[PDB]
Design an enzyme around this catalytic site. Structure first.
Site, PDB file in Angstrom:
ATOM      1  CG  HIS A   1      -0.814  10.441   5.111  1.00  0.00           C
ATOM      2  ND1 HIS A   1      -0.764  10.688   6.573  1.00  0.00           N
ATOM      3  CD2 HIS A   1      -0.816   9.306   4.839  1.00  0.00           C
ATOM      4  CE1 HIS A   1      -0.833   9.210   7.115  1.00  0.00           C
ATOM      5  NE2 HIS A   1      -0.932   8.381   6.169  1.00  0.00           N
TER       6      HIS A   1
ATOM      7  CG  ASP B   1      -4.500  21.140  -0.671  1.00  0.00           C
ATOM      8  OD1 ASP B   1      -3.611  20.153  -0.178  1.00  0.00           O
ATOM      9  OD2 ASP B   1      -5.372  21.933   0.016  1.00  0.00           O
TER      10      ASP B   1
ATOM     11  CG  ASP C   1       2.429  -7.944   1.901  1.00  0.00           C
ATOM     12  OD1 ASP C   1       3.530  -7.676   1.483  1.00  0.00           O
ATOM     13  OD2 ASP C   1       1.463  -7.852   0.749  1.00  0.00           O
TER      14      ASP C   1
ATOM     15  CG  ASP D   1       1.542  -9.478  -3.464  1.00  0.00           C
ATOM     16  OD1 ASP D   1       1.327  -8.792  -2.571  1.00  0.00           O
ATOM     17  OD2 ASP D   1       2.588 -10.391  -3.286  1.00  0.00           O
TER      18      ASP D   1
HETATM   19 CA   LIG Z   1       2.644  -7.384  -0.983  1.00  0.00          CA
HETATM   20 CA   LIG Z   2      -3.764  18.419   1.377  1.00  0.00          CA
END
Ligand SMILES: [Ca+2]
Ligand SMILES: [Ca+2]
Ligand code: HEM
Length: 349
Positions: free
Chosen positions: A52, A73, A199, A206
């Site tokens: 993000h 940044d 998961d 994995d």
């Molecule tokens: Ca996993």
């Molecule tokens: Ca940024």
């Protein structure tokens, strides 16, 4: 960049003397941010934070005369009151606030700290690649604009176009960077429950993410019909619409299936794309390689096969989408179908 190979006060040699200071950052965040080097909630949040912070860059916008963001940044931390209010960044102010103090105490840039914590976080998860860490990101001077971080309800074409604009990544590399959902949970999509994993092994780096998203979705794990959420195949596990659709799209389906039972391709591809994300908005040749400070990743313990079908699932539950190569025949763990345990996040997630 002139690097000066050196031996730090702890007795370790690094590629540049400036890297030695990051050993104190390491010991501090391992004990005080990741609770003893765990691959738990703060580690997961820190990995998410890298994407993000970095993907918020847009050459297309710069070409239109608008600021498109500075990439990796540290803007999401510096301008947290702005960026963490963007809907794609929901729940990230919690980890930004836990990270802030470390930045100020050690005097490192916010961008370099986010990349460092992401690499250290991953090194705590068994199975992770040996991670890189380069320094050199100057503090952002302007917040990223919104509309740059993909949402779970965006179409495959929108996400492909977004990452292509951001770093010239193609559709294959989009699949590689989604390997980080193998060590991850969802706190804000279902309002009734926090911490549902993507998961069944959220503490293990994995390919279970790639196996389990290919199974037929049969139920919602908590409440039904939340925006961006689709049915998942196991109790306790959540599946988002973007991952579901990228696993089945003809452009990405074979690359998605390529990680099943292929640990060395998963590790190599994710090592590569994670480093690329942390260099967005930067000149690689002007950065310093401090990868020797990052801890060695550990192997997956035990003697289970690398990839498997979770208990109660077989090849019959797979929605085959790759036309070139049949889904591999995996072993099924014995016993009854078991729910995936949630990962409760710290307050404010
Ligand atoms: Ca996993
Ligand atoms: Ca940024
Ligand atoms: C490309 C499109 C992507 C989409 C649409 C997406 C979507 C999501 C969503 C909806 C969540 C749960 C957020 C919440 O409940 O607050 C999430 C969590 C997460 N994402 Fe992604 N993601 C994407 C790519 C990435 C990439 C490239 C990375 C890493 C390099 C990443 C790392 C993670 C991690 C580690 C988590 C779990 C956070 C936690 O456990 O708190 N994701 N993602």
């Amino acid at each position: 960049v002139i690097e000066k190979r050196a031996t730090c006060s702890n007795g370790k040699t690094v590629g540049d003397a400036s890297c030695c200071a990051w050993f104190d950052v390491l010991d501090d965040i391992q004990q005080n941010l990741f609770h003893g080097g765990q691959c738990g909630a703060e580690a997961h949040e820190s990995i998410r934070l890298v994407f993000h912070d970095s993907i918020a860059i847009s050459p297309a916008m710069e070409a239109q005369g608008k600021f498109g963001g500075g990439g990796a940044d540290g803007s999401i931390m510096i301008f947290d009151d702005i960026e963490t209010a963007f809907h794609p960044n929901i729940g990230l102010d919690e980890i930004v606030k836990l990270q802030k103090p470390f930045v100020q105490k050690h005097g490192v840039t916010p961008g370099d700290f986010i990349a460092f914590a992401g690499a250290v976080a991953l090194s705590n998860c068994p199975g992770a690649p040996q991670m890189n860490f380069f320094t050199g990101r100057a503090p952002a001077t302007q917040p990223a604009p919104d509309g740059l971080v993909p949402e779970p309800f965006h179409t495959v074409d929108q996400i492909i176009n977004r990452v292509n604009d951001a770093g010239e990544f193609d559709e294959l590399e989009l699949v590689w960077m989604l390997s980080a959902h193998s060590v991850a949970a969802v706190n804000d999509v279902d309002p009734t429950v926090q911490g549902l994993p993507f998961d069944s092994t959220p503490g293990i780096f994995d390919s279970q993410f790639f196996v389990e998203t290919q199974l037929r979705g049969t139920a919602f794990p908590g409440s039904g019909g939340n925006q961006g959420e689709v049915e998942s195949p196991l109790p306790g596990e959540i599946r988002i619409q973007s991952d579901h659709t990228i696993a089945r799209d003809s452009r990405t389906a074979c690359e998605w299936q390529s990680f099943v039972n292929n640990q060395s391709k998963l590790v190599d591809d994710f090592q590569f794309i994670f480093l690329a994300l942390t260099q967005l908005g930067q000149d690689p040749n002007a950065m310093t390689d401090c990868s020797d400070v990052i801890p060695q990743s550990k192997p997956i313990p035990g003697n289970l096969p690398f990839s498997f079908f979770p208990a109660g699932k077989t090849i019959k539950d797979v929605e085959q989408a790759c036309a070139e190569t049949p889904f591999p025949t995996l072993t099924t763990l014995p016993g009854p179908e078991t729910s995936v345990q949630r990962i409760p996040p710290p307050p404010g997630a």
